[model samples]
Structures are given as structure tokens and as C-alpha cells.
Target: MKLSELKAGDRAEVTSVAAEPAVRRRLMDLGLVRGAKLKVLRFAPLGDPIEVNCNGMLLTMRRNEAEGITVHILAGDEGHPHGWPGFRRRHRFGKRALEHHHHHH
Candidate 1:
């Protein structure tokens, strides 16, 4: 089901995100990658903006963007509240990204 269709208190795992490259990247940056877990928190009074607990972060986005995300419902709520098991941070390999682990000898 699409993320936009889920009601408050629903839990789901992201399957795929389809949108323009820029929008797709933004969604992934907010923890919407495949296999990432999320929950519907609430919606705006008029339901234009949706709020969700995504991988432990509370994020809000427009309904139009949420429509492009596909997710599979997670039954019975048996997973971690933060996310799936052993969630790892995506690392960048830039000079600053790694920091100065071997410096100041």
C-alpha cells in the first residue's frame, strides 16, 4: 500500500519510492529507504500534510510526496520502535566524513 493511504497508528516498512530523482533522494535521506520502518503519527486538520515516525525520527511531508512511496504493512507491531534490527548509519568517504581518527599522534 502507498504511505499516503495509511491511517494514524499504522506501521509499515518501505518497499520502494518512486518520484523525480531529487524528491526520491530527499525521501531516502529522511529514512525512507527500502526496509526502513515507519508509522503514521497523524495528519493535518485538512490532511494536506502528514506526520510520521520514520526510523525514530518524526517527519512531516506533503500528501503528494507520500503518494509516491510504497510500503508493506507490518502486522502485530513486533519490531523495534526505533527501527529494524541493527540499523547502521550510511557513511560517506570524504575527508571530513571519516574525521581525524589517526591524527594528533
Candidate 2:
């Protein structure tokens, strides 16, 4: 299954980080290489990017980026971290924040 399909507390081993150009390189640099183990921490309020525990640390990744990663589930998939802790609120181009700004003016 894809990494994006996993939920907070779930564990998985990455099969591959299939992305465009430097995207793969970047992911690899962030310890997202094949065979890497990861634990889902939580997702943004709107599910833009999700926080993950990998390579002895926590990191955030976009939903689509995670989609490019293939993984095999291990455990968890229970407690969803739905809150303000790992919230992104804005992504790619701050779409959500920009929309809110326009709405207020």
C-alpha cells in the first residue's frame, strides 16, 4: 500500500520514494530511502502534509509526496492525532491562508 494510506500510530517500511527529478533525491536526503522504517505521527488539519517519525527523528511530508512512497504496514492505525500539534495550516503556496485572507477582506 501507499504511505499516504496510513494513519497516525501506524508503522511501515518504505519500498520506494518515486517522485519527479530532485524530489526523489530530496526524499532520500530526508531519510526516506527504500527499506526505511517510519511511524505516522499525524496529519495537518486539512490533511495537507502529515508528520512522521523516521530515521530516529520526526519529519513532515505532503500527502501527494507520501502517495509516491510505497510501504508495507506494520502496526497501529488506531489513535488519530487530529489536532493543532503538527498542523501546517499552509502548504505549497499557502493556499489555505491566502483563501482565508481574501475572505476576510
Candidate 3:
């Protein structure tokens, strides 16, 4: 799903970013990259700038910027349990990394 599809409080890991080289590079420099874990914190009431928690920091981006990114929602047991940034948080591999590793077995 595109980043724009996520709602406040949804957690998803970035799978791909597509945009003009500059836009993509700018986002990556700000740490929105493949395999990066992020959570949608909220959106502007008018829905222009969406705020997200990325790499433990809060960042807001334009809707157009968000639409270029793709992700798979981390629902069900895959979700990070409440009270994160704990041992289980840093230790577990992301869903895609786990899938890639599992695919080889």
C-alpha cells in the first residue's frame, strides 16, 4: 500500500520509494528508506502534511511525497506490542527481512 493509505496509529515498514531522483534522495536522506520502520502519528486536519514516527523521530511530509512510497501494513501478531523501544523492539527483524530470509530456507 502507498504511504497515503495509512491512517493515524498504523505501523508499516517501507518496502520501496519511487519518485524523481531528487525527491527520493531527499526522503532517503531523511531516513525514509526501504526496510525502515515507521508509524503514522497523525495527519493535518486538512490532510496536507502527514506526521509519522520514523527511526524514533517525528517527521511530517506532504501527501504527494507520501504517495510515492510503498509499504505492507504490520497487523495481527506482526505489530509491535504496546510500550516499544524495548528489547523486543530492536531485536526483531522487520517483516520483509524475515520473509526474505525465510524464502531461502
Candidate 4:
């Protein structure tokens, strides 16, 4: 199934990233390579940018983008509340605070 089909809290392992260059590049940059374990963290209010944990980082991707990524559902709960508190930091990007801190250094 596609990653977009997974519900918040579901766990799965990446089987393959679609062959599309952009999709593969994006997923690969986020460490969604084959055989990686992942967990659906949450979805946006409208469920477009789904947040998920991969390679010890929490990253959000648009549903359309996620469609290009195939995965195998693993036996586990649908969500993890505190299983990965530091995930966001590990994958941090796009925030003004982070940008400023990096630029000032």
C-alpha cells in the first residue's frame, strides 16, 4: 500500500520508492530508502501533509507525494504519542527560528 493510505499511528516498512525522479529524490533525501521502518505520526487538519517517523526522524510529506512511496504495514498500533519526542528536531527545517540560528552562526 502507499504511505498515504496508512492511518495516523500505523506502522510500516518502506518497500520501495516510486521510480519518479522527484518522488524518489524527495523520499531518499528524507531517508525513506527501502527496508526502513516507519510510523505514521499524524496528519494535517485536512490530512494532506502526513507526518511520519523514518530513520529516527519525523518528517511530513504531502499525500500526493506519499502516493509514490509503497510500503508494507507492520503489526503495531495506529499511533505513537511519545515514542519519538525528538523526531522533529532531528528532521527540523523550514522554521524561521532554525534558519536564523543557522545563518547567524
TM-score of each: 0.68, 0.66, 0.68, 0.65
Model 3 regions lying over 4 Å from their true place:
77-105
Clashing pairs in model 2? none
Q: Rate the local accuracy (lDDT) of all candidates.
A: 0.82, 0.78, 0.81, 0.80
Off by over 4 Å in 4: 76-105
lDDT tens digits, residues 28-105, model 3? 898988878899999999988899998787878888888988876777564554543553455655656554575465
Q: Number of clashes in every candidate structure?
A: 0, 0, 0, 3
Q: Rate residue 62 of model 3 by lDDT.
A: 88
Clash pairs detected, candidate 3: none
The residue-by-residue lDDT of candidate 2 on 4-104, one tens digit each, is: 99887889988767677598887779887887899998898888788889877787878998888888676545685343332356335443555457546
lDDT per residue, candidate 1, 86-105, as tens digits?
33664555444556665754
Find the candidate with the highest lDDT and give its number.
1
Q: Which TM-score value belongs to model 4?
A: 0.65
Better of 1 and 3 by lDDT: 1
Per-residue alpha-carbon lDDT of candidate 4 for residues 1-105, written as tens digits (9 for 90 to 100)? 688888889889998776578768877887888888999999898868889998788887788878878887777446653454553565655446554575465
The lDDT of model 1 is 0.82
